[PDB]
Subunit: 290 residues, 4 copies
């Protein structure tokens, strides 16, 4: 497996100097840095090429996460939003192609976080979504990009909350490059079984996010990491595992993730770095070759 | 310890004929029925007495749960909202005393569920709430009621998310009738240690809600029940334990709890009855 | 799934008035009573029909457990011990048939408990055992009995300590009536994964013993019961599940099981019955479907 | 917190060239090397100073483990055996003082492994042992050595099988240089609660052995490491943590520990080294 970490562990907005983080995680021993998609549509060609060259020169692979805006909601009942959305993704996937990125994940079938003050139509949203994802998927394939649909807890989305729902949705889409994506923090809430959910995902699992129950770095909390490693070995998971810790208050990240206390316990950057590296060593040790 | 269940397990709105449920759970074997406070202020003085009568007749003890509305938000920066909130609690609490209820719990220090659309001010809300709660505490003490502050996960509230934050708030309130309340569903998300959180609550723990990670009845999910039982013995817990399963879609309950799939797996009322009864045997066995 | 309990939970010797426990256990709600095989060769056909009819009357299914003596050692290098051993099971299995018992289990490929002051030849004992068991297995087929080979921890046996070893031994024996048997107390010591060991057992699993890490009744300890239910479901286990708690010091049972403190904490018979009943409610709830 | 490993992980007999292992574990990053006491009584005085020189040279602290032989049984009903036992330990402890080691642990109140084809007189053995250990304690105190009594599973000892029995024994001995010692492999069998056993030992815990359920190195097994680390933090443990993995068949070690299958799966020295270092990183990280 290839191990990565989301840059947002160090930042409070959905954008940053990704080159700085590529240099950092390469020194910490990671294989991957996952970056937020938000700023990419504003990258000039030379900026995309420099980012790509940076990743390549440092032996780092870039993956992309995206929490879509309501205006990029592929499941919208408004035909215009669905059109703006497909247009947004099309342009984004081409940028990913130029970046040599082959994976994007997150609530790509909806938007995030969900504004629950608006009325919900799961059934209706579900079918518009399946349709929209079907065609975005075709652009993704032409770009060499796997489009991973992340199963989320109920407080963050209502369409896909369990691995079974994720598999159902992905089978309906029925496209080779559209995958299910799990996240230990979300599984921790919705699943009857962690290993079971992973085996349920099976051949459809295309990406995995890690973090403790309250989103600390993997290892020192209650997530059943050994059971997870066993299940990944049962399904022959080949993919990437990207830890996504959020331990700092503040900014759009703190607000969207809902960090209302200093979970980092006053850590400075170097401290954060050390904990992520210990967490990487732990992940490689516990999660592999079971 | 005394075991109960929240009536909402069977209903989709924050009210119901509580008499029908006092008889149901008395039969199923529960010692307690927990009821939503919402419809109570619309109970006449006579309706109160028959509810109480109905409870005493069935050997069932009544506890109350309450997810406050924005207008009952004791943490509010708006003095008129705070004023109305103290009035609601004082009226609600006098009714509780006449109903012969000695415990109310929920996000009593705030409102539920939070609309994260508005602007949050944790620091200021926290100070206002501590003060408003201490006042309300005098009334709760009078009506012989335990004002229980429930620690909730980050998605449903931002003031108190861990047992440690709960104990800090309660110690700040510094009042006899205010307790910390824990819920296995919420602890499962926010805590480093389930047993550790319970031990942190210690003597301040006044009420406990149970449910699996995804809110099914206690037993066949991933919650560490043995560890909870051992930690309650460590602190010598002598309160009640109320299961709060939510396995049904629809209504204000389904929307507030966020049940977007049929977790009950098509259960009918009898099937719901059986599972709750089995979870009750399980809880008395494992937890004590 | 059918749920039972070992009568020994109440007794300190490997024999007892099984009719008394058949009645007790029917009132507590079990579907099965497991009895020790050692007193059965001393039973007349009258006692065998007596026991069978009584089980039948209280609706209880009977299963058998046996910790073989050194003289009943099917793996012994001494060919006379092996001949006497085969004679012993040949007789026993015919009695089981008369009792309409379709399952016996324990360290049937060896003897129990092992005396480590002796000489070990795991490789040698293993080969002799596979040979003897396959033979006994024909007699088992004939008597309609499932010969279950229990995987034990290292302190009690050295031949088969993990589900994988148990599976290798059974595959090698290669006979329909031989199955692997697992016990949560033994898996707790030896296995890397509990769900994994069950799954490795797979279709070869023919019997399951349960108890907490320190042998108390199932449920209030550290054994991962939910994980066990899942794995039993993953392999579609239909067999029975028998709790085998040991919480009392004294006697052969106490010395053989090595109970050196009062784990029951003063439990009198009624208290023991209460906990077994609660543990049985727990097992049906957590372990099934 | 100091972390070590028992040298027997790489050897099949209760002795070896400890200098070779001091260099190896310093290179892998350990703080401590734990050695078997067995060969030490017979160390010339030169060999004692060389061993100590090496340890200091490599920045390694040495701790000692010991499975006493039947003739060294301080609990024996036989007075000549108790006499020898006491002479054995006073000589061993004085050497330890020379070797500059401050900790010895194991079934020091008895002998190991127990021969169960003999008569078990628990109450009598227990009384004699408490009295004997108390005497030895005085010498241990003079040599600046913590005499740690290890709690073992039922198959390896019958006097002390739980943390509660270990604490009861140590409190009866009533001497500051005598401590309780826990081992995750042994707790995994006997305890109701791992965290609970650690909290029961509390201030009395003077040493801790680690290993997976089946004695593989810590990390990929079922032992609840986070719970252990949280309980060590609960009591404020000021001792060391020594992993005692046993993954190889053969010799006195393989038969005393009862390894009947190749648990190491063909590992050569280099592979045993890497797995030890990975478990060390895991332990420092998870146990805090
Ligand atoms: O689990 C999550 C969100 O809770 C991740 O998918 C990521 O943070 C999100 O997609 C926004 O970047
Ligand atoms: O756990 C919670 C909310 O998740 C409850 O205690 C809440 O106050 C109650 O559900 C309101 O009806
Ligand atoms: O678990 C075991 C032994 O520890 C049993 O299966 C044994 O065969 C039985 O207890 C003998 O009576
Ligand atoms: O855990 C134990 C024995 O199972 C050890 O501490 C023992 O004292 C040592 O292994 C002997 O060398
Ligand atoms: Mn995620
Ligand atoms: Mn931490
Ligand atoms: Mn922690
Ligand atoms: Mn609750
Ligand atoms: Mn057994
Ligand atoms: Mn008990
Ligand atoms: Mn040890
Ligand atoms: Mn217990």
């Amino acid at each position: 497996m290839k191990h990565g970490i989301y840059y947002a562990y160090w930042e409070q907005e959905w954008e940053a100097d990704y080159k700085y983080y590529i240099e950092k995680v390469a020194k910490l021993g990671f294989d991957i840095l996952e970056i937020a998609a938000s700023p990419l549509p504003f990258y000039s060609d030379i900026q995309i090429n420099e980012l790509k060259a940076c990743a390549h020169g440092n032996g780092i692979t870039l993956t992309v996460g995206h929490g879509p805006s309501a205006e990029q909601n592929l499941s919208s009942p408004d035909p215009d939003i669905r059109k703006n959305a497909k247009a947004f993704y099309t342009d984004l996937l081409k940028r990913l192609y130029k970046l040599d990125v082959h994976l994007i994940g997150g609530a790509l079938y909806s938007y995030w976080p969900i504004d629950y003050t608006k009325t919900i139509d799961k059934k209706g949203d579900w079918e518009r979504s399946v349709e929209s994802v079907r065609e975005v998927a075709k652009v993704a394939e032409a770009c060499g990009v796997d489009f991973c649909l992340e199963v989320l807890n109920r407080f963050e989305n209502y369409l896909i909350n369990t691995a079974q729902e994720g598999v159902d949705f992905v089978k309906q889409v029925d496209h080779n490059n559209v995958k299910v994506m799990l996240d230990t923090f979300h599984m921790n809430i919705e699943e009857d079984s962690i290993g079971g959910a992973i085996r349920t995902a099976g051949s459809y699992l295309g990406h995995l996010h890690t973090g403790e129950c309250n989103r600390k770095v993997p290892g020192r909390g209650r997530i059943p990491w050994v059971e997870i490693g066993e299940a990944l070995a049962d399904i022959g998971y080949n993919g990437s595992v990207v830890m996504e810790p959020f331990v700092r208050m503040g900014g759009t990240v703190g607000s969207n993730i809902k960090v209302w206390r200093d979970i980092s316990n006053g850590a400075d950057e170097k401290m954060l770095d050390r904990e992520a590296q210990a967490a990487l060593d732990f992940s490689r040790y516990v999660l592999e070759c079971h």
